[PDB]
Amino acid sequence: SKYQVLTVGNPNSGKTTLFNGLTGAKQQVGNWAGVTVEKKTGSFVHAGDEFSLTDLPGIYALDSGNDSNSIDESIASRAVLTHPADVIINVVDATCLERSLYMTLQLRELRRPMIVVLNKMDALKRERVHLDLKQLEAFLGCPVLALSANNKEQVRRFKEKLHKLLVQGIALKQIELHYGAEFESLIHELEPMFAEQAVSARALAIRALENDRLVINGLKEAERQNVEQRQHECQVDIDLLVANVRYTYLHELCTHVRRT
Numbered sequence: 001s002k003y004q005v006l007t008v009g010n011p012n013s014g015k016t017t018l019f020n021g022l023t024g025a026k027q028q029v030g031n032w033a034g035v036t037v038e039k040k041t042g043s044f045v046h047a048g049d050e051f052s053l054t055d056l057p058g059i060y061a062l063d064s065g066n067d068s069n070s071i072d073e074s075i076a077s078r079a080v081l082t083h084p085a086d087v088i089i090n091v092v093d094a095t096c097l098e099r100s101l102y103m104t105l106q107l108r109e110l111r112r113p114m115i116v117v118l119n120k121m122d123a124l125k126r127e128r129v130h131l132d133l134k135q136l137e138a139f140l141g142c143p144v145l146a147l148s149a150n151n152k153e154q155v156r157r158f159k160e161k162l163h164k165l166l167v168q169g170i171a172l173k174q175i176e177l178h179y180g181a182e183f184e185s186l187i188h189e190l191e192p193m194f195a196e197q198a199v200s201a202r203a204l205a206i207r208a209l210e211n212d213r214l215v216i217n218g219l220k221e222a223e224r225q226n227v228e229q230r231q232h233e234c235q236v237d238i239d240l241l242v243a244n245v246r247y248t249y250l251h252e253l254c255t256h257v258r259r260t
């Protein structure tokens, strides 16, 4: 079998280190379709199956229609929405969970098969910090694996676990992110227009309320006007509201996960 894998994470997460450890010399560099940004792909074979890897440029969040130039965030937002992938590997710097897991939450809302890879666990153990990984799986609702991407042996072990999870299929558990009665009803008003898409209608409705360019652009003018009218029905700033809700959840998460 041939498996398609996307790797996504913040800059400095060790995403490139894991990618290189998995593919070695079997890598190519090109361009993303329609732009000049570098496209890095690689492959490896394991236990008779082929693994096809596409690396996404490092980003801190998905596209939210922010004038902040960020061609990379558009590319990663597009890929995370429309690029084929049997699994999205979200590489997270475990020494920096509260910030790194912000995009993790956005990815989880898409409901695409994904796993969270906590990288730099050696740095954590140097800080004498323990992460309750079962609690972390409970809060994220997706497989969570911990390693150091500079350790060849742990990377080799990661291949076996990744291969097993792809053969099993990835079991996702609903993520209890509630944005408050008012915004939830706005998501509810908008969800039917994103039914019958390749991604969660709830996710697309949220991203459209966040003004994700990749979502808004595909809409017809009347659908755009329904989205922009919903946006002004929000009594508060949508960007602040979703950030608050996401970071409030991540504060509860770290409490029950992180111990020194």
Ligand SMILES: Nc1nc2c(ncn2[C@@H]2O[C@H](COP(=O)(O)OP(=O)(O)CP(=O)(O)O)[C@@H](O)[C@H]2O)c(=O)[nH]1
Pocket (backbone or CB within 6 Å): 009, 010, 011, 012, 013, 014, 015, 016, 017, 018, 058, 119, 120, 121, 122, 123, 147, 148, 149, 150, 151
């Ligand atoms: N201690 C430790 N450092 C690691 C580990 N994985 C990567 N690093 C370090 O983190 C730094 C960033 O890694 P890199 O792979 O470059 O990060 P990225 O997230 O791919 C972003 P970019 O490659 O553009 O910097 C590197 O200096 C690398 O040595 C790990 O498991 N443990």
